[PDB]
Design a protein around this ligand. Structure first.
Ligand code: HEM
Length: 388
């Protein structure tokens, strides 16, 4: 198998050979170190003093390229920086993700979720949950967060992705980029004139001109690219995982805390991101017994780390009622997922509304093959036929 070891999955789990890899070992056509132990991953990611994030990195680089990011060194990209610089940028974008801001988004996320569910219900059982829900809700949620008018969301999605879609002609990508920046600049101007509750309005309300247009543009794109695939992947695999353990669906038929715990567990169990941004040792050091030399690259396997046998004797099982396990699916350290609360809220809303609307949800065909999404930076499904 030519595909990198950290990219291999078996069903909803990490490949056996990935799970069998040592805590920290070398892998290969550049070569890097690979961290699979929970403690090691936490050490590498939490110590920004010795492991800086590899500036200008693409979560794809393989067979595909169809619909993937294009950095070009984008200012305002939290990932391309480290403290104290990172701390400055982060603090600047934080106003849009406060928990109070997230609580207020709850009602809107529900509205969006129900609107997609309405379209699926109208199509009749059986239907593809991925086409109707998983692939639609994330982007709409992000548009709502950013402050994009409801009627411009479809257009905005096309312009955002399009101006970064390599598979497109240069004439097209450039036309889409022109319109994109133009639209973005006009949105930014309106937010500075009269700040709204959106991400941009929150930032400009707090820091005014200190937040330049370039920064805001950078923030928007970065956020648009960071919160889509991860979520669509979680919705699809998440529903599949729950349908395979139907008794655990009761965690979504009760209080909020119970739904929250289920979501956290699903996020740990499925760990859609294969790995975070590569970490580069800023000096020579000895980790997990290995001799790391300045300039060495370290790839962290979040899925393997979240299956570390040290975490629990049944860490390999899905158990929404288990004693919560501090997973690393959102990362660890100063770069910890800025949209983690939103992701948890969004995913809790989807699952709760889903099973409330379709109590008898099930796979259209018990023996149907699973259509895994293998061409994206995050694991997921391309299709999932369900009946109710
Ligand atoms: C279940 C879904 C999600 C997962 C599993 C996830 C996971 C991650 C991981 C592992 C990192 C850290 C990367 C690193 O340290 O190199 C990260 C960073 C980040 N995520 Fe997410 N993410 C999710 C959803 C979202 C959403 C919905 C948004 C946006 C609303 C988002 C915004 C970000 C941003 C901006 C960062 C960078 C923070 C920084 O560098 O300081 N993510 N995410």
């Amino acid at each position: 198998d030519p595909r990198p070891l950290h990219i291999r999955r078996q069903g909803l789990d990490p490949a056996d050979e990935l799970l069998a890899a040592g805590a920290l070992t070398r892998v290969t056509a550049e070569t890097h170190w690979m961290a699979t132990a929970h403690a090691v991953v936490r050490q590498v990611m939490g110590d920004h003093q010795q492991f800086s994030t590899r500036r200008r990195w693409d979560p794809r680089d393989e067979i595909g390229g169809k619909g993937i990011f294009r950095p070009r060194e984008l200012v305002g990209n939290l990932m391309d920086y480290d403290p104290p610089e990172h701390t400055r940028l982060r603090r600047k974008l934080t106003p849009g993700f406060t928990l109070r801001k997230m609580q207020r988004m709850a009602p809107y996320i529900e509205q969006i979720v129900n609107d997609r569910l309405d379209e699926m219900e109208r199509a009749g059982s059986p239907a593809d949950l991925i086409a109707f829900v998983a692939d639609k809700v994330p982007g709409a949620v992000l548009c709502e967060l950013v402050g994009v008018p409801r009627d411009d969301r479809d257009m905005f999605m096309k312009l955002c992705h399009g101006h970064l879609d390599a598979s497109l002609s240069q004439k097209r990508r450039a036309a889409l980029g022109d319109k994109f920046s133009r639209y973005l600049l006009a949105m930014i101007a309106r937010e500075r004139k009269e700040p709204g509750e959106g991400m941009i309005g929150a930032v400009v309300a707090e820091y005014g001109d200190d937040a330049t247009d370039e920064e805001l543009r950078g923030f928007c794109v970065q956020v648009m690219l960071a919160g889509d695939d991860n979520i669509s992947g979680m919705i699809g695999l998440g529903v599949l995982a729950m349908l395979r353990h139907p008794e655990q669906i009761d965690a979504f038929r009760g209080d909020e805390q119970s739904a929250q715990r289920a979501v956290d567990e699903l996020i740990r169990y499925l760990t859609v991101p294969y790995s975070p941004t590569p970490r580069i040792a800023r000096e020579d050091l000895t980790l997990a017994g290995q001799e790391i030399k300045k300039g060495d690259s370290v790839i962290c396997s979040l899925p393997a780390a979240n299956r570390d046998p040290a975490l629990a004797p049944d860490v390999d099982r899905l158990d929404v009622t288990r004693e919560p396990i501090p997973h690393v699916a959102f990362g660890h350290g100063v770069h910890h997922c800025l949209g983690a609360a939103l992701a948890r809220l969004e995913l809790r809303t989807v699952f709760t509304e889903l099973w409330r609307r379709f109590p008898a949800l099930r796979l259209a065909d018990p023996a149907q093959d699973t259509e895994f999404r293998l061409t994206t930076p995050a694991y997921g499904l391309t299709e999932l036929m369900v009946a109710w």
